[PDB]
Design a binder for this molecule. Sequence first.
Ligand SMILES: N[C@@H](CCCC[NH3+])C(=O)O
Ligand SMILES: [Ca+2]
Ligand SMILES: [Ca+2]
Ligand SMILES: [Ca+2]
Ligand SMILES: [Co+2]
Ligand SMILES: [Co+2]
Length: 316
Amino acid sequence: ITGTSTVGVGRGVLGDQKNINTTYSTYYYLQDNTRGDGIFTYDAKYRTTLPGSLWADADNQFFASYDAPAVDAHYYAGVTYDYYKNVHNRLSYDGNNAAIRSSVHYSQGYNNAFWNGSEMVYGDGDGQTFIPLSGGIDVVAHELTHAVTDYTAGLIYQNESGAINEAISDIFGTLVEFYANKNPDWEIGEDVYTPGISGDSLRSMSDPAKYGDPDHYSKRYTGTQDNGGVHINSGIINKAAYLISQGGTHYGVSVVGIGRDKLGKIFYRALTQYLTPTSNFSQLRAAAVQSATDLYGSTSQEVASVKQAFDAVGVK
Ligand SMILES: N[C@@H](CCCC[NH3+])C(=O)O
Ligand SMILES: [Ca+2]
Ligand SMILES: [Ca+2]
Ligand SMILES: [Ca+2]
Ligand SMILES: [Co+2]
Ligand SMILES: [Co+2]
């Protein structure tokens, strides 16, 4: 809509208050004009037709329980846009400041969230396995990163390229979580998963095997479920990235950590310059090494760490 930019206040899924950017025109809408061509959040009203209605609110105050997921989807998309812009100099997912849209209250008891090729979609969860998915900043950034990949490497969603695509989304959702300093960790979805159980998460980058995902190439899944194990085999790549960043000894191989910032720089460069739709793990290793070489020099420690980390997960 056309209107006046303003700021409203509300409460997120976890109960935390935050300010959000709104647009006033008779109603207050969840439309943030401060970022690129705008961030817009929609109400899918428990249906599966998309996008639903642009979020309209009467008073610029979003404290109703039905508002919670919209507030977080709206806010976390802003943060993620900021991360890309500030950190990598990239304007929105297309690099051209494309509007960012998300719908919430998608379907009923839907335990998932996704990027559908045009926008983001978030379920409310069933209240047992998950609470509304947009309450996790790593979830929001994982989804938005899928847009980034679509517009850049374009990794197809199956087999190795598909696992790389998902790992990429976990790496970057985690770097975003550290960026916002929102109780950061190397776990995925900890904040919205199994409200009943503390301590767990959906996936672990630090120890994928903790939840039964592979942490070495020799353990890859080779069947057909999950599109050829996109969400399973991403653990091998997640582990590698954790090592590059944090360092460690894995399967006897020692890796000196080079930190998060360099991890992001390296991976972002690989994604945007070297990866292709059909790249496999071995190709990702080459890309990562080339990126680091570019950035830091072939005899750099950085290059060394990237090599070690892949060797440690068995990726040649
Ligand atoms: N995003 C993942 C994890 C969600 C867990 C199942 N709802 C998937 O599509 O498998
Ligand atoms: Ca966290
Ligand atoms: Ca996390
Ligand atoms: Ca839990
Ligand atoms: Co209100
Ligand atoms: Co994903």
